[PDB]
Amino acid sequence: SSSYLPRAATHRNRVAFQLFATPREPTASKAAAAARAAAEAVARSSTVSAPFTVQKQQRLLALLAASDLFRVHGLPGFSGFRPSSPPHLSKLFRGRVSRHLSCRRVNHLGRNNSGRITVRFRGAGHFRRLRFVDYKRGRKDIFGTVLRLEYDPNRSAHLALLQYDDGVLSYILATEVTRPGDRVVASKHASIAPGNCLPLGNIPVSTIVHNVELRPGAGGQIVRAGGCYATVVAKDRHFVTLKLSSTEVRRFPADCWATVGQVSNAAHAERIRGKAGVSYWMGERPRTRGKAMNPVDHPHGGGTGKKGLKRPPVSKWGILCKGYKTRAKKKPLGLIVRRKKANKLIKKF
Amino acid sequence: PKNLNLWGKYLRLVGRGARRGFKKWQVIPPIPVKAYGREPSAASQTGLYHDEDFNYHTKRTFSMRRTRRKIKPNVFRRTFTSSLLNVTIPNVRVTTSALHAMDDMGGFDAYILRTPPQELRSHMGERMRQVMYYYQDQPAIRDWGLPWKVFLKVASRRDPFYACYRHNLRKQQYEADLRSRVRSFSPYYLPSGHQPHAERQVFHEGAGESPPLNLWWRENRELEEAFRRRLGEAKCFERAFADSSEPLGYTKGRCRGGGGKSGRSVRRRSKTHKYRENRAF
Amino acid sequence: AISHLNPSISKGKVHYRVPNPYIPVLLLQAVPGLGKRGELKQVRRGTLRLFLAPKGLAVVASWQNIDAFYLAEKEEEERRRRAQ
């Protein structure tokens, strides 16, 4: 939404910089020398250069899996309620998100500036905070330590609290293999390890990446949801081809940055709610069927007793919604190499 | 008849009753506004539209069903450089007729300076002409190069120094407010120098020991403040938007199918319907 | 100039045809492929607006500019003769 920072701060089509520098040296020449030294140090430390594939991810996950005093004494808690795990054993932090890196979420409740409902079936849900996650990874050639992993109510993936070597705190998207104590860096000289951020031109083919920039320096926009990932297919001097989670093959400028690995929380899809109340907490409202209404209220409505659709499926607004394409025909494909087809055709061919 | 340069030739000498009883829906195509004798619109008076402005036309079918529709002018947003005003003027709303008139006169400055009021048909153009003459009278104010709308009002003309002072003061207030908001929403947070260690989970077995923090920003308070402000300048992301100044920009219409909400006959906004919702015009 | 006859009406907008997209201009400098100095050439309005006038290679063929060029050339010739 636009209820956060104003347009003048949020909107910028062409970003003129890709390195958010924070020099320590007194002069520009010494700052440049220090930046070169830091890049050389990152290059020296970098040793891994082979692609990071699905199989290597599985091997790392297998290795990670293979590898009474701590309580509040005298504190009888609730009669029945108890946390699923104590703080020193839970996968997630179990604490509270940093106040300095978040703010209260403005809940629009599916209504636009006109006050009318534009997004249907939205409910209040549980109170939420928006947290400021660094989609840019602007700080380059500085190593950071993952201190903890955190839940995010607006996002399907997990977040990670990164403490840079100078004490700066930030939140980044966590990878499926990201654990506390991990060391991460953003640079073109970085090794090919999960969590590291590199330009798409410095990532070998077959590697798995996430948080891909459409425009250099504008922050990753593609492949963000939990468990999602994209694969590097081909590379040329100016463009790198990626296969996306939707089975879409698209080219990206070689200068667009990306992070190695799969998005954390790949088990999101396995969640079972069990009752309407869980979705109610999550922020959903009941969905009344089109054919349950009167003919004035939906094209499928009307008819004594129950009936069928009586016509090819259409939405409330009279548009075919089963097989009818909606992308603008005249809109150019641009860098899109090939866009996916229907899932039935994909699975039958 | 007379006034052959204006519309109404065959109405001029038919009688009073016909003139009062004339039915506008008789006119299918739009008539030029200057020849029709139509009042300029507020949009035209705030831009340089020359012969173009909001108009009307009638739709007639073989069944003899008539319908009148308002039609908007074809306007672009373009930037100009003015030597007489000593400033670039962003996002002036102009038309094809206006552009051709500028070509005929010899450019933007010549068009503003020389065009008669009837042909110019732009109060904004008249104000620009006034500011050009004022700058001719007082060159020292022209050397400042402030946006021309600073001196649009006569009082600002009478008190130029206060105009510049107030302009700069409001600009600085805007800058400070925006800087504070960006700092508040920045993605980088630097904790206090007496407690930089944030709460962490147990490090996974085999993770290399983290090196001690390098607090180079504690040598000097001035360095600390500069570093903190620099960190506050950071942004999470940068968004793309429709901008006619970009070669490949575009806007959006309605859905591909072309249908509407079932059973709803939406009424378009007018001056007697949703007239003042969320903004004046 | 535009013409108000048979305009294109679409999207609620009106677009007017330009039957004559040409304007005469006086060449102030040698333009390779267009002409020499002092010539009156019919060019396209866009060409005048975005290349010739901004680069100072030509100007609209108004009586003022034509007369100014003529008088300047006459003065330059008289200056040559005075120098001789």
């Binding site: 603008a328 025909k329 005249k330 809109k331 | 006619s244 970009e246 070669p247 490949l248 920009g249 575009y250 806007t251 959006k252 219409g253 309605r254 859905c255 591909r256 | 999207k11 045809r17 330009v18 039957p19 004559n20 997209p21 040409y22 005469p24 009156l40 019919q42």
Partner: peptide
């Protein structure tokens, strides 16, 4: 018009791009 580009590619056969440069002096 779901897609509404600011600049529309010019057509080859339109009269606008093929109109004649006209004549400076009609009499000759």
């Amino acid at each position: 018009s779901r897609y509404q580009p600011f600049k529309t590619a010019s057509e080859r056969e339109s009269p606008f791009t093929e109109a004649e440069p006209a004549t400076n002096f009609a009499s000759p």
